[PDB]
């Protein structure tokens, strides 16, 4: 009966940002102030709505996207931004209606000597469209010389590992991010706040 936000925010494993996760939320009651009442979040920013107003709204579906990035990239998880993440990994639309929530996960996602399991896309021939996802691993070709499937001078594997170490500066520490997007359709509204 309650929307399963605990399973999203409290998941044991989080995806790499290039292969970001998405859960569809529907047919449930969502207590958002449950979320924003917690001081646990270093970012909790909504666009086109208020945290409180949400409990008084309804929606066709809610999507919860989630992934890990660097602290200093959290600012790219926002409408209108550019940079490696916004351009090549996870792109919100200019008119994003939703909330972006994040928290430092250095204690779970860093490892002595480096956690290299979290990856990002470093090279892409064009920028992602909003909510587009690219998990391909084709060699990226700079300049004119075909790669023919081989890494080399002008040919690079397109994903690079963050390699998080507990001792990084905070800007380079891992953050877990959840993006909530609120879908209004010409169809039945199945996700509502406790005020409706």
């Amino acid at each position: 009966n309650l929307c399963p936000f605990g399973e999203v925010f409290n998941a044991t494993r989080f995806a790499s940002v290039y292969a970001w996760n998405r859960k569809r939320i529907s047919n449930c009651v969502a207590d958002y102030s449950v979320l924003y009442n917690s001081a646990s979040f270093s970012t909790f920013k909504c666009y086109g709505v208020s945290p409180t107003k949400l409990n008084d709204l309804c929606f066709t579906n809610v999507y919860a996207d989630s992934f890990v990035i660097r602290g200093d990239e959290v600012r790219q998880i926002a409408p209108g931004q550019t940079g490696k993440i916004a351009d090549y990994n996870y792109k919100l639309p200019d008119d994003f209606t939703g909330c972006v929530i994040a928290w430092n996960s250095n204690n779970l996602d860093s490892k002595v000597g480096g956690n290299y399991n979290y990856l990002y896309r470093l090279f892409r021939k064009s920028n992602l469209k909003p909510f587009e996802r690219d998990i391909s691993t084709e060699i990226y070709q700079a300049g004119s010389t075909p790669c023919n499937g081989v890494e080399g001078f002008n040919c690079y594997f397109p994903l690079q590992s963050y390699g998080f170490q507990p001792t990084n500066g905070v800007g380079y520490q891992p953050y877990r991010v959840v993006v909530l997007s609120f879908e209004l359709l010409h169809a039945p509204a199945t996700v509502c706040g406790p005020g409706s």
Partner: antibody
Amino acid sequence: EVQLLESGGGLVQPGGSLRLSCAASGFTFSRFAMTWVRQAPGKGLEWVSAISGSGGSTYYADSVKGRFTISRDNSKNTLYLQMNSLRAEDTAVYYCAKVGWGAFDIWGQGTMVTVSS
Amino acid sequence: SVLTQPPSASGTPGQSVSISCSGTYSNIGSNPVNWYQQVPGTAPKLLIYANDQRPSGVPDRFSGSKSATSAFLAIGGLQSEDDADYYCSTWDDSLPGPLFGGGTKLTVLG
């Protein structure tokens, strides 16, 4: 701890030849493409030539094609540039650099080549 | 064909500056951009790769950004020791090796 130590520059007359060397240490040389970039006095940077980690693929700017040959000796961590048919306009500081993620991430401090009569 | 940079830039100590690099869809628009710093008398040093990534040891007051056909290097907290020629570089779909812009001489005004 990475070092790229160049040598072999000097003064030659037009039509002469020179062989530059770049001695690499402090990284896994054979895993990286390597490149030469030159800079004429008071001018900008010009990519010259590059070579794959194994040495089995080489790349050249049009300005030096047919005159310069890049090679490497992975048993000695040494990168070479053989320069034949030298012209006044090849006068420059020649840098070797390691290639990393589409960029030149470590550069030697250069060796000066003067082509003059 | 060519990457174009303004020949000079300046700011006063502790302020910011932005250095631009203009090209075309077939180079800057399609390929990762790098930035290099060359203090006179020394070799170029990589500041920015893959448009906006810093190698280890480059402080976060250097940052890179890119528009459709232009790239930009921003330098905050200017110091005198930032006096140098700054070069953008990228690849072009028609050439085997990278291009460099003509360089921008930065002077922190004294």
